[PDB]
Amino acid sequence: SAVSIPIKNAGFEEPSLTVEDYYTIDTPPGWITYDPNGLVPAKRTRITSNNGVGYTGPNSAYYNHKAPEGRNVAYVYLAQEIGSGIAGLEQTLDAVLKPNTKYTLTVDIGNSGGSFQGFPLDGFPGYRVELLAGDTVLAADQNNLYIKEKDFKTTTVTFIATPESPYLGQHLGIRLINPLQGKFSGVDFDNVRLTAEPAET
Amino acid sequence: SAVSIPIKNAGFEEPSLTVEDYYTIDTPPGWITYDPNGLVPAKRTRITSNNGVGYTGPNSAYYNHKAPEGRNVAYVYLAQEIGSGIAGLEQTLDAVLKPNTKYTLTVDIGNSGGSFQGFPLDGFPGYRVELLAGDTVLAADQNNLYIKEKDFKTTTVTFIATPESPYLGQHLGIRLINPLQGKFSGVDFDNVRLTAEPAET
Ligand SMILES: CCCCCCCCO[C@@H]1O[C@H](CO)[C@@H](O)[C@H](O)[C@H]1O
Ligand SMILES: [Ca+2]
Ligand SMILES: [Ca+2]
Ligand SMILES: [Ca+2]
Ligand SMILES: [Ca+2]
């Protein structure tokens, strides 16, 4: 039986937002900004490279339906040209890597779309989801899922750790990445879940 | 209406090998060595990092069954310590990325087991399969599949190119990668397949 591994602010429901105050431009609570190529400036604005939380309700400009989970989704927007680097959000968990364990990391990916006040969100930068142990990427999915404009779709990253793994006992981690492989170059995430179950191995 | 895209030496059937002349330490013909971190030496021996083709019959030392396809499989072996880098095999194809098209890249990943003169092949470095256009990785799977010792399993990488794609007209490519995340640090590949079919959106 698959056991849920606790994640901080896993559905980006913090902070609480309203139809009136419907976004932040700050790293979601419980998450760290991942910016290996320095695309996110020290001084952010809503038009600079940024990440944050967006109230995604039933009358969202950007989606046909409300948030897959709760009220809010996370977003990662990059202003730089295609191919300039990758950036996103990451979180180190308290849980550690166990042998003969199958890990299932599920995340909803959002392709924000439509036109709002005459501006198009048509196009998509792609996505990458990574499961880590320590600072090793154990498993990853980059763009295997196609997401239509104004839709959210669920991707799944799986990994089995064997008794011979070099990473046993190292802290699990998660990264949610915008790889900047298209414009418009915003991608959203919601409802991060991670389970562990016994595996034959 | 799924169209097969030609790949050179896609099953690593070249060169032809015999029971007694059963491996190479040279790059499989039609493929190129992918060595971004310089792990493969200019002059290779059996104990250096290397790659090549191996005959894999129905009574192999390393596998429960014969090669997934034909007589041969490719291998990528890295001698350096876990975490030193990645290497493998890559091929640029004649075909180019086209819009409104779903690409499906299928390849068999092998976890060689058994032993070589009391050198156990127990353990596995992981794998990563990448679909490219030009120099960009469009889509990738790293370690989503678990492969038991002495088995092969099929993985797939899927990508849809939209009309907004920045990579249309660029040549497709394939990379089969040993990410050196474990020892024994050899991983095998066979039966590389790429199809293209109309997609909506
Ligand atoms: C003129 C272009 C400036 C950048 C556009 C606004 C960037 C804000 O970011 C957008 O916000 C939404 C949540 O608020 C998310 O759903 C979108 O994916 C995200 O990219
Ligand atoms: Ca949510
Ligand atoms: Ca979009
Ligand atoms: Ca073969
Ligand atoms: Ca092995």
Coordinates of C-alpha atoms and ligand atoms in Angstrom, one line a residue:
Chain A
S1 CA 0.0 0.0 0.0
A2 CA 1.4 3.4 -1.2
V3 CA 2.1 5.9 1.6
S4 CA 2.0 9.7 1.1
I5 CA 5.2 11.5 1.8
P6 CA 4.6 15.0 3.3
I7 CA 5.6 18.0 1.2
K8 CA 5.4 21.6 2.3
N9 CA 2.7 23.7 0.6
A10 CA 2.3 20.9 -2.0
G11 CA -0.7 22.5 -3.7
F12 CA 0.6 26.0 -3.4
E13 CA -2.5 26.9 -1.3
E14 CA -0.2 29.2 0.8
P15 CA -0.6 32.1 0.8
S16 CA -4.4 32.5 0.7
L17 CA -5.4 34.7 -2.2
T18 CA -8.7 36.2 -3.4
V19 CA -10.2 37.2 -6.8
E20 CA -8.9 40.8 -5.9
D21 CA -5.3 39.9 -4.8
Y22 CA -4.8 37.0 -7.2
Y23 CA -1.0 36.6 -7.4
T24 CA 2.4 36.9 -5.8
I25 CA 5.8 37.3 -7.4
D26 CA 7.6 35.7 -4.5
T27 CA 8.9 32.2 -4.2
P28 CA 6.0 30.1 -2.8
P29 CA 6.3 29.3 1.0
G30 CA 8.1 26.0 1.6
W31 CA 9.7 26.1 -1.8
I32 CA 13.1 27.5 -3.0
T33 CA 13.8 29.2 -6.2
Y34 CA 15.9 27.0 -8.5
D35 CA 17.9 29.4 -10.8
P36 CA 21.2 27.7 -11.9
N37 CA 21.6 30.1 -14.9
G38 CA 20.7 33.4 -13.1
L39 CA 17.6 34.2 -15.1
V40 CA 15.5 35.5 -12.1
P41 CA 16.6 39.0 -11.0
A42 CA 17.1 40.1 -7.3
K43 CA 14.5 42.8 -8.0
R44 CA 11.4 41.0 -9.5
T45 CA 8.3 42.5 -11.1
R46 CA 5.3 40.9 -12.7
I47 CA 7.0 41.3 -16.2
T48 CA 10.5 40.2 -15.1
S49 CA 11.5 36.5 -14.8
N50 CA 9.7 35.3 -11.7
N51 CA 7.8 32.6 -9.9
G52 CA 4.9 32.8 -7.5
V53 CA 1.4 31.7 -6.7
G54 CA -1.6 32.5 -8.9
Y55 CA -5.3 32.3 -7.8
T56 CA -6.8 30.1 -10.5
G57 CA -10.6 30.2 -10.1
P58 CA -13.5 29.1 -12.3
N59 CA -13.4 32.4 -14.2
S60 CA -9.6 32.5 -14.8
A61 CA -8.5 34.4 -17.9
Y62 CA -5.8 31.8 -18.5
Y63 CA -7.6 28.4 -18.0
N64 CA -10.9 26.8 -19.1
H65 CA -11.3 25.3 -15.6
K66 CA -10.2 26.3 -12.1
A67 CA -7.1 25.0 -10.4
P68 CA -6.8 21.2 -10.4
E69 CA -6.4 21.4 -6.6
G70 CA -7.7 24.1 -4.2
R71 CA -7.6 27.7 -5.2
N72 CA -4.0 28.3 -6.3
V73 CA -1.3 27.1 -8.7
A74 CA 2.4 27.9 -8.9
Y75 CA 3.9 29.6 -11.9
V76 CA 7.4 30.0 -13.3
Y77 CA 7.8 32.7 -15.9
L78 CA 11.1 33.4 -17.8
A79 CA 11.4 36.7 -19.8
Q80 CA 14.7 35.8 -21.5
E81 CA 15.0 34.4 -25.1
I82 CA 14.4 30.7 -25.8
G83 CA 17.5 28.7 -25.0
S84 CA 18.8 31.1 -22.2
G85 CA 18.6 28.4 -19.4
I86 CA 16.2 26.7 -17.1
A87 CA 14.6 27.8 -13.8
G88 CA 11.9 26.6 -11.4
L89 CA 11.1 25.6 -7.8
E90 CA 12.6 23.0 -5.6
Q91 CA 12.0 21.5 -2.2
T92 CA 14.1 19.2 0.0
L93 CA 11.9 16.8 2.0
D94 CA 12.4 15.3 5.5
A95 CA 11.8 11.8 4.0
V96 CA 14.9 9.8 2.9
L97 CA 15.5 7.3 0.1
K98 CA 14.6 3.7 1.1
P99 CA 15.7 0.4 -0.7
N100 CA 13.1 -1.9 -2.3
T101 CA 10.8 1.2 -2.5
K102 CA 8.9 2.5 -5.5
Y103 CA 8.5 6.3 -5.5
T104 CA 5.7 7.9 -7.5
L105 CA 5.9 11.7 -8.0
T106 CA 2.7 13.2 -9.6
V107 CA 2.3 16.8 -10.6
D108 CA -0.2 18.7 -12.6
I109 CA 1.3 20.9 -15.4
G110 CA -0.6 23.9 -16.6
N111 CA -0.3 25.5 -20.1
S112 CA -1.8 29.0 -19.3
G113 CA -3.5 30.3 -22.5
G114 CA -6.1 32.5 -24.1
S115 CA -5.8 36.3 -24.6
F116 CA -6.2 38.7 -21.6
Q117 CA -6.4 42.5 -22.1
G118 CA -5.3 41.9 -25.7
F119 CA -2.1 40.0 -24.9
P120 CA -1.6 36.3 -25.9
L121 CA -0.3 33.5 -23.6
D122 CA -0.3 31.2 -26.7
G123 CA 2.9 29.0 -26.8
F124 CA 4.5 26.9 -24.0
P125 CA 8.0 26.7 -22.7
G126 CA 7.7 23.0 -21.8
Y127 CA 8.3 21.5 -18.4
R128 CA 10.6 19.1 -16.5
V129 CA 9.9 17.4 -13.2
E130 CA 12.7 15.8 -11.2
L131 CA 12.9 13.5 -8.2
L132 CA 16.1 13.9 -6.3
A133 CA 18.1 12.2 -3.6
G134 CA 20.7 14.5 -2.1
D135 CA 21.7 16.6 -5.1
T136 CA 21.4 13.7 -7.5
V137 CA 18.4 13.7 -10.0
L138 CA 17.2 10.1 -9.6
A139 CA 14.4 10.3 -12.2
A140 CA 13.0 12.9 -14.5
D141 CA 10.3 13.6 -17.2
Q142 CA 10.9 16.4 -19.7
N143 CA 8.0 17.1 -22.0
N144 CA 6.6 13.6 -22.4
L145 CA 3.1 15.0 -21.7
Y146 CA 1.5 17.4 -24.2
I147 CA -0.7 20.1 -22.5
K148 CA -3.2 22.1 -24.7
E149 CA -3.6 25.8 -24.2
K150 CA -5.8 26.6 -21.1
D151 CA -5.4 23.0 -19.8
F152 CA -3.8 21.2 -16.9
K153 CA -2.6 17.6 -17.3
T154 CA -0.9 15.2 -14.8
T155 CA 2.5 13.8 -15.3
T156 CA 4.1 10.9 -13.3
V157 CA 7.7 10.4 -12.4
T158 CA 8.6 6.9 -11.0
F159 CA 11.7 5.5 -9.5
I160 CA 12.7 2.3 -7.7
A161 CA 15.6 2.3 -5.3
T162 CA 17.5 -1.0 -5.0
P163 CA 19.4 -2.4 -2.0
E164 CA 22.6 -1.5 -4.0
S165 CA 21.7 2.2 -4.5
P166 CA 24.4 4.7 -3.6
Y167 CA 21.8 7.2 -2.4
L168 CA 20.1 5.3 0.4
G169 CA 19.3 7.6 3.4
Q170 CA 19.8 10.8 1.4
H171 CA 17.0 13.4 1.6
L172 CA 14.4 13.2 -1.2
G173 CA 13.8 16.4 -3.2
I174 CA 11.6 17.6 -6.0
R175 CA 12.2 20.1 -8.8
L176 CA 9.6 21.8 -11.0
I177 CA 11.3 23.3 -14.0
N178 CA 10.6 25.8 -16.8
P179 CA 13.2 24.8 -19.5
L180 CA 12.5 27.9 -21.7
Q181 CA 11.9 25.9 -24.9
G182 CA 9.1 28.1 -26.3
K183 CA 7.2 31.4 -26.0
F184 CA 4.9 32.3 -24.3
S185 CA 7.4 31.1 -21.7
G186 CA 5.2 30.6 -18.6
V187 CA 4.3 27.2 -17.1
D188 CA 2.2 26.4 -14.0
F189 CA 2.3 23.5 -11.5
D190 CA -0.2 22.2 -8.9
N191 CA -1.0 19.4 -6.6
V192 CA 2.4 17.9 -6.0
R193 CA 2.2 14.4 -4.5
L194 CA 4.8 11.8 -3.7
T195 CA 4.1 8.2 -2.6
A196 CA 6.4 5.3 -1.5
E197 CA 5.4 1.7 -1.7
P198 CA 7.3 -1.6 -1.3
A199 CA 8.7 -2.8 -4.6
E200 CA 10.0 -6.2 -5.9
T201 CA 13.7 -5.6 -6.6
Chain B
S1 CA -1.1 6.9 -39.7
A2 CA 2.2 6.4 -37.9
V3 CA 5.3 6.8 -40.1
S4 CA 8.6 5.0 -39.2
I5 CA 11.6 7.3 -39.3
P6 CA 14.8 5.7 -40.6
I7 CA 17.7 5.3 -38.1
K8 CA 21.1 4.0 -39.1
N9 CA 22.1 0.7 -37.4
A10 CA 19.0 1.0 -35.2
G11 CA 19.4 -2.5 -33.6
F12 CA 23.2 -2.4 -33.5
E13 CA 23.2 -5.4 -35.9
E14 CA 26.4 -3.9 -37.4
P15 CA 29.1 -5.2 -37.0
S16 CA 28.0 -8.9 -37.3
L17 CA 29.6 -10.8 -34.5
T18 CA 30.1 -14.5 -33.7
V19 CA 30.1 -16.6 -30.4
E20 CA 33.9 -16.4 -30.4
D21 CA 34.2 -12.7 -31.7
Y22 CA 31.4 -11.4 -29.5
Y23 CA 32.1 -7.8 -28.6
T24 CA 33.6 -4.5 -29.8
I25 CA 35.0 -1.6 -27.9
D26 CA 34.4 0.8 -30.9
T27 CA 31.5 3.2 -31.5
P28 CA 28.7 1.4 -33.3
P29 CA 28.6 2.4 -37.0
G30 CA 26.0 5.0 -37.8
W31 CA 26.2 6.3 -34.1
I32 CA 28.5 8.9 -32.6
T33 CA 30.1 8.9 -29.1
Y34 CA 28.4 11.4 -26.8
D35 CA 31.0 12.5 -24.3
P36 CA 30.4 16.0 -23.0
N37 CA 32.5 15.5 -19.9
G38 CA 35.5 13.8 -21.7
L39 CA 35.1 10.4 -19.9
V40 CA 35.9 8.3 -22.9
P41 CA 39.7 8.2 -23.7
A42 CA 41.2 8.7 -27.2
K43 CA 42.6 5.2 -27.0
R44 CA 40.1 2.7 -25.5
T45 CA 40.8 -0.7 -23.9
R46 CA 38.5 -3.2 -22.3
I47 CA 38.9 -1.5 -18.9
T48 CA 38.6 2.1 -20.0
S49 CA 35.3 3.8 -20.5
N50 CA 34.0 2.6 -23.8
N51 CA 31.0 1.6 -25.8
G52 CA 30.3 -0.9 -28.6
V53 CA 28.1 -3.8 -29.6
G54 CA 27.8 -7.2 -28.0
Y55 CA 26.4 -10.4 -29.3
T56 CA 23.6 -11.5 -27.0
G57 CA 22.3 -15.1 -27.7
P58 CA 19.7 -17.2 -25.9
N59 CA 22.3 -18.5 -23.4
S60 CA 24.2 -15.3 -22.6
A61 CA 26.3 -14.8 -19.4
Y62 CA 24.7 -11.4 -18.9
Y63 CA 21.0 -11.8 -19.8
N64 CA 18.0 -14.0 -19.1
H65 CA 17.1 -14.0 -22.8
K66 CA 18.6 -13.2 -26.2
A67 CA 18.8 -9.7 -27.6
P68 CA 15.4 -8.0 -27.8
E69 CA 16.1 -7.6 -31.5
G70 CA 18.4 -9.6 -33.8
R71 CA 21.7 -10.8 -32.4
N72 CA 23.3 -7.7 -30.9
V73 CA 22.9 -4.9 -28.3
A74 CA 24.8 -1.7 -27.7
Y75 CA 26.6 -1.0 -24.4
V76 CA 28.0 2.1 -22.7
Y77 CA 30.5 1.5 -19.9
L78 CA 32.0 4.3 -17.7
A79 CA 35.0 3.5 -15.6
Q80 CA 35.0 6.8 -13.6
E81 CA 33.5 7.2 -10.1
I82 CA 29.7 7.7 -9.6
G83 CA 28.8 11.3 -10.3
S84 CA 31.8 12.0 -12.6
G85 CA 29.5 12.8 -15.6
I86 CA 27.4 11.3 -18.4
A87 CA 28.1 9.7 -21.8
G88 CA 26.5 7.5 -24.4
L89 CA 25.6 7.3 -28.0
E90 CA 23.9 9.8 -30.3
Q91 CA 22.7 9.9 -33.8
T92 CA 21.5 12.8 -36.0
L93 CA 18.7 11.8 -38.4
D94 CA 17.8 13.0 -41.9
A95 CA 14.2 13.7 -40.8
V96 CA 13.4 17.2 -39.4
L97 CA 10.9 18.4 -36.8
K98 CA 7.4 19.0 -38.2
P99 CA 4.4 20.8 -36.6
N100 CA 1.2 19.0 -35.6
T101 CA 3.2 15.8 -35.2
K102 CA 3.5 13.3 -32.3
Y103 CA 6.9 11.6 -32.1
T104 CA 7.3 8.3 -30.2
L105 CA 10.9 7.2 -29.5
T106 CA 11.0 3.6 -28.2
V107 CA 14.1 1.8 -27.0
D108 CA 15.0 -1.3 -25.0
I109 CA 17.2 -0.7 -21.9
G110 CA 19.2 -3.6 -20.6
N111 CA 20.6 -4.1 -17.1
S112 CA 23.4 -6.6 -17.9
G113 CA 23.9 -9.1 -15.0
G114 CA 26.0 -12.2 -14.3
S115 CA 29.8 -11.8 -14.3
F116 CA 33.0 -11.5 -16.4
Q117 CA 35.9 -13.5 -14.9
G118 CA 34.5 -13.2 -11.4
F119 CA 33.9 -9.4 -12.0
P120 CA 30.2 -9.1 -11.1
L121 CA 28.0 -7.0 -13.3
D122 CA 25.6 -6.5 -10.3
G123 CA 24.3 -2.9 -10.1
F124 CA 23.2 -0.4 -12.7
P125 CA 24.2 3.2 -13.6
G126 CA 20.7 4.2 -14.6
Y127 CA 19.7 5.4 -18.1
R128 CA 18.4 8.5 -20.0
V129 CA 16.9 8.6 -23.4
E130 CA 16.6 11.9 -25.2
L131 CA 14.8 13.0 -28.4
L132 CA 16.5 16.1 -29.9
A133 CA 16.0 18.7 -32.6
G134 CA 19.2 20.3 -33.6
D135 CA 21.1 20.7 -30.3
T136 CA 18.1 20.9 -28.0
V137 CA 16.6 18.1 -25.9
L138 CA 12.9 18.2 -26.8
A139 CA 11.9 15.4 -24.4
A140 CA 13.6 12.9 -22.1
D141 CA 13.1 10.0 -19.7
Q142 CA 15.6 9.4 -17.0
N143 CA 15.1 6.2 -14.9
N144 CA 11.3 6.2 -15.0
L145 CA 11.6 2.4 -15.7
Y146 CA 13.1 -0.1 -13.3
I147 CA 15.2 -2.8 -15.1
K148 CA 16.0 -6.0 -13.1
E149 CA 19.5 -7.6 -13.4
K150 CA 19.7 -9.6 -16.6
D151 CA 16.6 -8.1 -18.1
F152 CA 15.7 -5.7 -20.9
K153 CA 12.6 -3.3 -20.6
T154 CA 11.1 -1.0 -23.2
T155 CA 10.8 2.7 -22.5
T156 CA 9.2 5.4 -24.6
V157 CA 9.7 9.1 -25.0
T158 CA 6.9 11.1 -26.6
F159 CA 6.8 14.6 -27.9
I160 CA 4.3 16.8 -29.7
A161 CA 5.6 19.6 -31.9
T162 CA 3.1 22.5 -32.2
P163 CA 2.9 25.2 -34.9
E164 CA 4.5 27.6 -32.3
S165 CA 7.6 25.4 -31.8
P166 CA 10.9 27.2 -32.2
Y167 CA 12.7 24.0 -33.5
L168 CA 10.6 23.3 -36.6
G169 CA 12.9 22.3 -39.6
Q170 CA 15.8 21.2 -37.3
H171 CA 17.1 17.7 -37.7
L172 CA 15.8 15.1 -35.2
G173 CA 18.4 13.3 -33.0
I174 CA 18.5 10.5 -30.4
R175 CA 20.7 10.1 -27.4
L176 CA 21.1 7.0 -25.3
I177 CA 22.9 8.0 -22.1
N178 CA 24.7 6.3 -19.2
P179 CA 24.3 8.9 -16.3
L180 CA 26.8 7.0 -14.1
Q181 CA 24.6 6.9 -11.0
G182 CA 25.6 3.4 -9.9
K183 CA 28.1 0.5 -10.3
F184 CA 28.5 -1.8 -12.1
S185 CA 28.3 1.2 -14.4
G186 CA 27.3 -0.5 -17.8
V187 CA 23.9 -0.1 -19.5
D188 CA 22.8 -1.6 -22.7
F189 CA 20.3 -0.6 -25.5
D190 CA 18.6 -2.2 -28.4
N191 CA 15.9 -1.9 -31.0
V192 CA 15.7 1.9 -31.4
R193 CA 12.5 3.0 -33.0
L194 CA 11.1 6.5 -33.9
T195 CA 7.6 7.1 -35.4
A196 CA 5.8 10.3 -36.4
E197 CA 2.0 10.7 -36.6
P198 CA -0.5 13.5 -37.1
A199 CA -1.5 15.0 -33.7
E200 CA -4.3 17.5 -32.9
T201 CA -2.9 20.7 -31.3
Ligands
LIG1 C1 3.9 41.2 -21.0 C2 4.3 39.9 -20.4 C3 4.5 39.9 -18.9 C4 4.4 38.6 -18.3 C5 2.9 38.2 -18.2 C6 2.5 38.0 -16.8 C7 3.4 37.0 -16.1 C8 2.7 36.4 -14.9 O1 2.9 35.0 -14.9 C9 1.6 34.3 -15.3 O2 0.6 34.3 -14.3 C10 -0.5 33.3 -14.2 C11 -0.9 33.2 -12.7 O3 -0.9 34.6 -12.2 C12 0.0 31.9 -14.6 O4 -1.1 31.1 -14.7 C13 0.8 32.0 -15.9 O5 1.4 30.8 -16.4 C14 2.0 32.9 -15.6 O6 3.0 32.8 -16.6
CA2 CA -3.5 24.2 -5.7
CA3 CA 0.4 28.8 -23.3
CA4 CA 19.8 -5.8 -31.8
CA5 CA 23.8 -4.8 -13.7

